[PDB]
Design a protein around this motif. Structure first.
Motif, PDB file in Angstrom:
ATOM      1  N   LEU A 114       0.494 -11.042   8.635  1.00  0.00           N
ATOM      2  CA  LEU A 114       0.898 -12.385   8.254  1.00  0.00           C
ATOM      3  C   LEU A 114       2.130 -12.828   9.037  1.00  0.00           C
ATOM      4  O   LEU A 114       2.717 -12.075   9.819  1.00  0.00           O
ATOM      5  CB  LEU A 114       1.167 -12.468   6.751  1.00  0.00           C
ATOM      6  N   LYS A 115       2.520 -14.083   8.806  1.00  0.00           N
ATOM      7  CA  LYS A 115       3.581 -14.698   9.596  1.00  0.00           C
ATOM      8  C   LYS A 115       4.943 -14.104   9.259  1.00  0.00           C
ATOM      9  O   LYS A 115       5.809 -13.975  10.171  1.00  0.00           O
ATOM     10  CB  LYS A 115       3.580 -16.207   9.371  1.00  0.00           C
ATOM     11  N   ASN A 116       5.140 -13.743   7.945  1.00  0.00           N
ATOM     12  CA  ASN A 116       6.406 -13.199   7.479  1.00  0.00           C
ATOM     13  C   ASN A 116       6.362 -11.705   7.176  1.00  0.00           C
ATOM     14  O   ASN A 116       7.403 -11.133   6.840  1.00  0.00           O
ATOM     15  CB  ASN A 116       6.880 -13.971   6.242  1.00  0.00           C
ATOM     16  N   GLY A 117       5.201 -11.058   7.288  1.00  0.00           N
ATOM     17  CA  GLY A 117       5.174  -9.608   7.242  1.00  0.00           C
ATOM     18  C   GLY A 117       4.229  -8.961   6.248  1.00  0.00           C
ATOM     19  O   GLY A 117       4.389  -7.781   5.920  1.00  0.00           O
ATOM     20  N   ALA A 118       3.250  -9.706   5.757  1.00  0.00           N
ATOM     21  CA  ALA A 118       2.251  -9.130   4.874  1.00  0.00           C
ATOM     22  C   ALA A 118       1.019  -8.721   5.670  1.00  0.00           C
ATOM     23  O   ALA A 118       0.788  -9.191   6.786  1.00  0.00           O
ATOM     24  CB  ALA A 118       1.864 -10.114   3.775  1.00  0.00           C
ATOM     25  N   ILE A 119       0.227  -7.820   5.090  1.00  0.00           N
ATOM     26  CA  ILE A 119      -0.984  -7.324   5.733  1.00  0.00           C
ATOM     27  C   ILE A 119      -2.168  -7.642   4.831  1.00  0.00           C
ATOM     28  O   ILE A 119      -2.083  -7.487   3.609  1.00  0.00           O
ATOM     29  CB  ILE A 119      -0.912  -5.813   6.025  1.00  0.00           C
ATOM     30  N   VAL A 120      -3.260  -8.105   5.431  1.00  0.00           N
ATOM     31  CA  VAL A 120      -4.486  -8.440   4.717  1.00  0.00           C
ATOM     32  C   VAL A 120      -5.658  -7.818   5.468  1.00  0.00           C
ATOM     33  O   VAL A 120      -5.616  -7.669   6.693  1.00  0.00           O
ATOM     34  CB  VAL A 120      -4.620  -9.981   4.562  1.00  0.00           C
ATOM     35  N   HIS A 121      -6.703  -7.425   4.730  1.00  0.00           N
ATOM     36  CA  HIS A 121      -7.796  -6.710   5.376  1.00  0.00           C
ATOM     37  C   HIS A 121      -9.076  -6.835   4.556  1.00  0.00           C
ATOM     38  O   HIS A 121      -9.064  -6.614   3.341  1.00  0.00           O
ATOM     39  CB  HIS A 121      -7.383  -5.246   5.558  1.00  0.00           C
ATOM     40  N   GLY A 122     -10.172  -7.178   5.229  1.00  0.00           N
ATOM     41  CA  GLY A 122     -11.441  -7.342   4.548  1.00  0.00           C
ATOM     42  C   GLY A 122     -12.525  -7.869   5.473  1.00  0.00           C
ATOM     43  O   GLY A 122     -12.555  -7.581   6.675  1.00  0.00           O
ATOM     44  N   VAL A 131     -11.250  -8.374  -0.186  1.00  0.00           N
ATOM     45  CA  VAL A 131      -9.925  -8.345   0.419  1.00  0.00           C
ATOM     46  C   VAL A 131      -9.085  -7.269  -0.252  1.00  0.00           C
ATOM     47  O   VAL A 131      -9.166  -7.089  -1.473  1.00  0.00           O
ATOM     48  CB  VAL A 131      -9.269  -9.732   0.260  1.00  0.00           C
ATOM     49  N   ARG A 132      -8.262  -6.552   0.523  1.00  0.00           N
ATOM     50  CA  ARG A 132      -7.096  -5.949  -0.106  1.00  0.00           C
ATOM     51  C   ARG A 132      -5.888  -6.261   0.770  1.00  0.00           C
ATOM     52  O   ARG A 132      -5.992  -6.393   1.999  1.00  0.00           O
ATOM     53  CB  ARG A 132      -7.242  -4.435  -0.370  1.00  0.00           C
ATOM     54  N   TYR A 133      -4.743  -6.385   0.105  1.00  0.00           N
ATOM     55  CA  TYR A 133      -3.583  -7.119   0.590  1.00  0.00           C
ATOM     56  C   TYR A 133      -2.317  -6.373   0.205  1.00  0.00           C
ATOM     57  O   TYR A 133      -2.125  -6.042  -0.966  1.00  0.00           O
ATOM     58  CB  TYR A 133      -3.576  -8.523  -0.025  1.00  0.00           C
ATOM     59  N   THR A 134      -1.458  -6.123   1.184  1.00  0.00           N
ATOM     60  CA  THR A 134      -0.169  -5.481   0.945  1.00  0.00           C
ATOM     61  C   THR A 134       0.950  -6.464   1.246  1.00  0.00           C
ATOM     62  O   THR A 134       1.089  -6.911   2.403  1.00  0.00           O
ATOM     63  CB  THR A 134      -0.013  -4.222   1.796  1.00  0.00           C
ATOM     64  N   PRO A 135       1.751  -6.837   0.249  1.00  0.00           N
ATOM     65  CA  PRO A 135       2.918  -7.690   0.501  1.00  0.00           C
ATOM     66  C   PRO A 135       4.111  -6.895   1.004  1.00  0.00           C
ATOM     67  O   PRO A 135       3.993  -5.704   1.308  1.00  0.00           O
ATOM     68  CB  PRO A 135       3.195  -8.315  -0.870  1.00  0.00           C
ATOM     69  N   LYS A 136       5.264  -7.551   1.100  1.00  0.00           N
ATOM     70  CA  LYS A 136       6.461  -6.934   1.656  1.00  0.00           C
ATOM     71  C   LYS A 136       7.057  -5.916   0.693  1.00  0.00           C
ATOM     72  O   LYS A 136       7.871  -6.268  -0.169  1.00  0.00           O
ATOM     73  CB  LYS A 136       7.505  -7.999   2.004  1.00  0.00           C
ATOM     74  N   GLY A 137       6.659  -4.654   0.834  1.00  0.00           N
ATOM     75  CA  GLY A 137       7.247  -3.584   0.054  1.00  0.00           C
ATOM     76  C   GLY A 137       6.886  -3.575  -1.413  1.00  0.00           C
ATOM     77  O   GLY A 137       7.609  -2.976  -2.212  1.00  0.00           O
ATOM     78  N   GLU A 138       5.791  -4.222  -1.796  1.00  0.00           N
ATOM     79  CA  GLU A 138       5.356  -4.270  -3.185  1.00  0.00           C
ATOM     80  C   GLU A 138       3.960  -3.665  -3.309  1.00  0.00           C
ATOM     81  O   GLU A 138       3.381  -3.176  -2.337  1.00  0.00           O
ATOM     82  CB  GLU A 138       5.389  -5.705  -3.720  1.00  0.00           C
TER      83      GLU A 138
END
Lengths: 193, 83, 87, 81, 88, 90, 73, 54, 86
Positions: free
Chosen positions: C19-27, C43-50
């Motif tokens: 993502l633009k600010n640092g998240a990852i998405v995948h599917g 989809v599974r999605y990883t935000p910033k350190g959460e």
């Protein structure tokens, strides 16, 4: 006398075009005569302040309509049509320079109190009254394919059955596609009442 | 996908939740009966435990109808079929 | 020629988007708009350190898409061929 | 002089291109440029904070990265006091 | 009343060659003082005999100056334009 | 091509005249009567209650707000029940 | 389609405050604007958050830097 | 009319809009039909049949 | 077709590597396959490295040139700081 605010609706412009069959300049003069007659009754009822209650198209409290064909416009709404078509005109200034004894010199793109050529057109005639005459004339006069060509130039589209429809129903359909709903009337009433 | 229930995640990390109504070419999001989520990670330091549990409080508030600016949406998650 | 349309017709994969600010998405991609706003399924999605979230679908705006990673089994040449009519 | 003919004047001439991030600047023999301000640079050398960080080669700079561009006709990169 | 467009203002400051102080967006400490040379549709200002000024971070006074010659300054980077009235 | 307008934009146009509450990229929530909103979402307000994220509560009149710097708007349920949500099939 | 001209006709020759990003306050009076709303201000006085007023002259600000307009009277 | 519409638009005897405002239309603006001429050859008979009985 | 387009097309034809510094403060070493008018980049044999400072037990540690390998990569034109045709 009861001091109720007043707006004007000049009706039966199809009678201007199709019954009297006067040219667009004389149609302008006919409209001007009717509006000044209304304002004359205003002044003869309240002397000295009928000008404070003056009705005129350039102010936006006069609405030109044909109710048998379901259309109405103000000068502001007609300039808004020009704005939505050609893009980027100042609508209030254009309407102000649309009514009156002003003339449009084309190659200078100027609005002058007198024409630059002997026989140049008024602003109202040239930009409002002749287009409505041509809409009527080409709607009732042309065949279905020529009519499809002309209305497709303007961006007006109908079903081909509607193209071959009767002249009166066809004229009402083309007027609906041209003028649209009564937003001009709603703007006039919101602004002046 | 119109008139489904949506959760929208916004760039600072907010969540706007509820029933969506329409959209546009700019994917501006209009959405109704909204309640908002803030994931404020509060340091609820217990007086008995030295471990500062940074608990992510998801506070909520109801507002009504939203008009989300299209240059602000990050994520859109579908929740439920229309009623 | 539009790489946006190229991505339209090489979409529908379990891709990895940063993502633009640092998240990852995948599917698995659903569709890509002319404004590059892709849509992902399963989809599974990883935000910033959460904590990560696994959802059914997730649409991502084109500007919010920063970085794009294709699967290694992509037919690159025959998906990079041109089929648009020449004006 | 208009900015576009100023840019074709800077074409095939040494330019100083200072970016908007980290006080980055470039010594560079410019080669060509397009209508939407993308600098084709050669003999590219890079300074951070007016110190020597080094030569890179021939590079390309986008519109969005540039703070300003000037000519390199006898201009020094030591920080003036 | 005379209504003056910003582009007409740019053209008349160009033809009068007044000194121009340029402030940049989200840069409260960097300014450029120079002599105007021209503009375009994106109002990119080519500037003559320009000096960049880094201001003090506390008192907002001019701390360091650096002349840089003739500079193309980018239109979106230009934020505020001030016509410095010279003492004549 | 003829340019159509977005449904949220025309919803702002229908929301002109009511007490709208919006908030902006500096985390600032403004309340008041909207008097004009344009296609680029530039708005004005006239009876503004201000709550700024630094804790600043105030009240004033006739503010102008940029649509790029706005974050979102809040409008009533009658504007939910507006006629444009009835999709007229043409 | 062409961008719409802003509705700043009430703000011509008006004693008004401007808020810019970075909390830059510019107290100005209009003389004219454009479709990009590049606000041109004469006899402008600008202001920093510590509360100091300095005189700038007849100036202009780019519309993207322009954020909030507040008239006073 | 204490102040006329044309007099408010131009000013007394200018016979010209003053150059400080000098409203001009964009070049693309033309009347809505412009190139179609006012009256087709068959417009006389079209109006006559408009008024013909059923 | 005489400037940046020429450099990108020459990179496409020669299949040579480029070193790209990008706005996340990151560094890239990868080959060139295709480009558009927006100069969006499609990449192969991508080696991505960056500077990360690990915050060990509340103290600032020495930086790490952390790097990964990506087989196939797509890049957006507005995310570039500088590209160097190595």
């Amino acid at each position: 006398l009861e001091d109720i605010p007043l707006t004007l609706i000049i009706n039966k412009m199809d009678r201007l075009i199709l019954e009297l069959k006067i040219p667009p300049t004389d149609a302008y003069f006919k409209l001007k005569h009717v509006i000044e007659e209304v304002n004359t009754v205003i002044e003869n009822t309240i002397p000295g302040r009928g000008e404070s209650k003056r009705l005129s198209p350039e102010k936006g409290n006069v609405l030109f309509a044909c109710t048998s064909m379901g259309w109405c416009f103000t000068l502001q709404s007609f300039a808004k049509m020009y704005s939505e078509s050609y893009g980027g005109v100042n609508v209030e200034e254009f309407a102000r320079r649309l009514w009156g004894d002003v003339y449009f010199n084309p190659k200078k793109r100027t609005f002058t109190r007198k024409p630059i050529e002997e026989g140049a057109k008024r602003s109202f005639v040239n930009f409002v009254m002749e287009p409505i005459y041509k809409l009527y004339s080409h709607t009732i006069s042309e065949g279905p394919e020529d009519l499809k060509r002309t209305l497709s130039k303007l961006g007006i589209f109908l079903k081909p059955s509607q193209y071959k429809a009767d002249p009166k129903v066809l004229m009402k359909l083309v007027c609906e596609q041209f003028f649209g709903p009564s937003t001009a009337f709603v703007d006039m009433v919101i602004k002046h009442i | 996908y119109i008139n489904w229930r949506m959760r929208v995640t916004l760039n600072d990390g907010r969540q706007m939740t509820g029933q969506m109504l329409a959209f546009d070419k700019h994917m501006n999001l209009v959405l109704a009966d909204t309640e908002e989520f803030r994931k404020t990670k509060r340091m609820q330091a217990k007086p008995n435990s030295s471990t500062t549990q940074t608990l992510i409080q998801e506070e909520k508030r109801t507002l009504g109808l939203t008009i989300v600016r299209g240059a602000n949406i990050i994520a859109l998650s579908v929740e439920s079929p229309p009623p | 020629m539009k790489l946006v349309r190229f991505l339209m017709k090489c979409a529908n994969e379990t891709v990895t988007i940063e993502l633009k600010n640092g998240a990852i998405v995948h599917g698995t991609i659903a569709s890509v708009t002319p404004k590059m706003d892709t849509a992902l399924r399963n989809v599974r999605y990883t935000p910033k350190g959460e904590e990560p979230y696994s959802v059914e679908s997730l649409t991502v705006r084109g500007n919010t898409i920063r970085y794009y990673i294709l699967p290694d089994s992509l037919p690159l040449d025959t998906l990079l061929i041109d089929d648009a009519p020449k004006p | 002089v208009n900015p576009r003919p100023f840019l074709q004047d800077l074409v095939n001439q040494d330019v100083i291109v200072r970016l908007k991030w980290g006080q980055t600047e470039y010594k560079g023999r410019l080669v060509s440029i397009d209508s939407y301000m993308n600098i084709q640079l050669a003999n590219t050398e890079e300074f951070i904070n007016y110190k020597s960080t080094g030569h890179l080669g021939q590079v390309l700079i986008r519109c969005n990265n540039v703070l300003w561009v000037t000519a390199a006709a006898g201009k020094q990169m030591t920080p003036t006091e | 009343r005379v209504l003056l467009p910003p582009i007409n203002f740019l053209f008349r400051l160009l033809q009068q060659r007044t000194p121009v102080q340029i402030w940049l967006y989200e840069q409260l400490a960097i300014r450029i003082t120079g002599v105007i040379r021209g503009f375009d549709e994106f109002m990119n200002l080519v500037i003559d005999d320009a000096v960049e000024i880094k201001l003090s971070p506390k008192t907002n006074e001019p701390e360091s100056k650096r002349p840089l010659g003739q500079i193309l300054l980018k239109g979106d980077n230009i934020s505020l334009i001030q016509a410095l009235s010279g003492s004549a | 091509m003829t340019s159509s307008i977005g449904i949220p934009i025309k919803l702002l146009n229908e929301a002109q005249g009511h007490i709208v509450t919006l908030e902006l990229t500096t985390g600032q929530t403004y309340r008041g009567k909207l008097i004009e909103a344009e296609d680029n979402m530039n708005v004005q307000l006239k009876d503004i209650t201000v709550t700024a994220r630094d804790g600043r509560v105030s009240h004033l009149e006739q503010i102008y707000i940029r649509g790029s710097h706005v974050r979102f708007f809040i409008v009533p349920d009658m504007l939910r029940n507006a006629p444009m949500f009835r999709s007229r099939n043409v | 389609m062409a961008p719409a001209q802003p509705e700043l006709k009430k703000y011509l020759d008006k004693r008004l405050f401007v808020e810019l990003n970075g909390s830059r306050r510019v107290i100005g009076v209009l003389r004219g604007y454009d479709v990009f709303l590049n606000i041109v201000l004469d006899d402008a006085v600008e202001e920093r958050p510590n509360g100091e007023k300095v005189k700038l002259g007849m100036v202009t600000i780019r519309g993207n830097s322009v954020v909030i307009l507040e008239p006073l009277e | 009319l204490t102040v006329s519409h044309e007099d408010e638009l131009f000013g007394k005897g200018n016979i010209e809009e003053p150059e400080e405002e000098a409203f001009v239309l964009p070049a693309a603006v033309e009347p809505f039909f412009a190139d179609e001429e006012l009256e087709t050859e068959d417009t006389r008979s079209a109006i006559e049949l408009w008024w013909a009985p059923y | 077709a005489n400037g940046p387009l020429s450099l990108l097309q020459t990179a496409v034809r020669s299949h040579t590597q480029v070193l790209i510094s990008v706005r996340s403060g990151r560094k890239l070493l990868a080959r060139v396959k295709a480009f558009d008018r927006h100069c969006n980049m499609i990449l192969e044999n991508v080696k991505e490295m960056w500077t990360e400072t690990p915050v060990t037990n509340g103290k600032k540690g020495r930086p790490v040139n952390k790097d990964r390998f990506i087989s196939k990569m797509f890049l957006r034109g507005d995310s570039v700081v500088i590209v160097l045709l190595s």
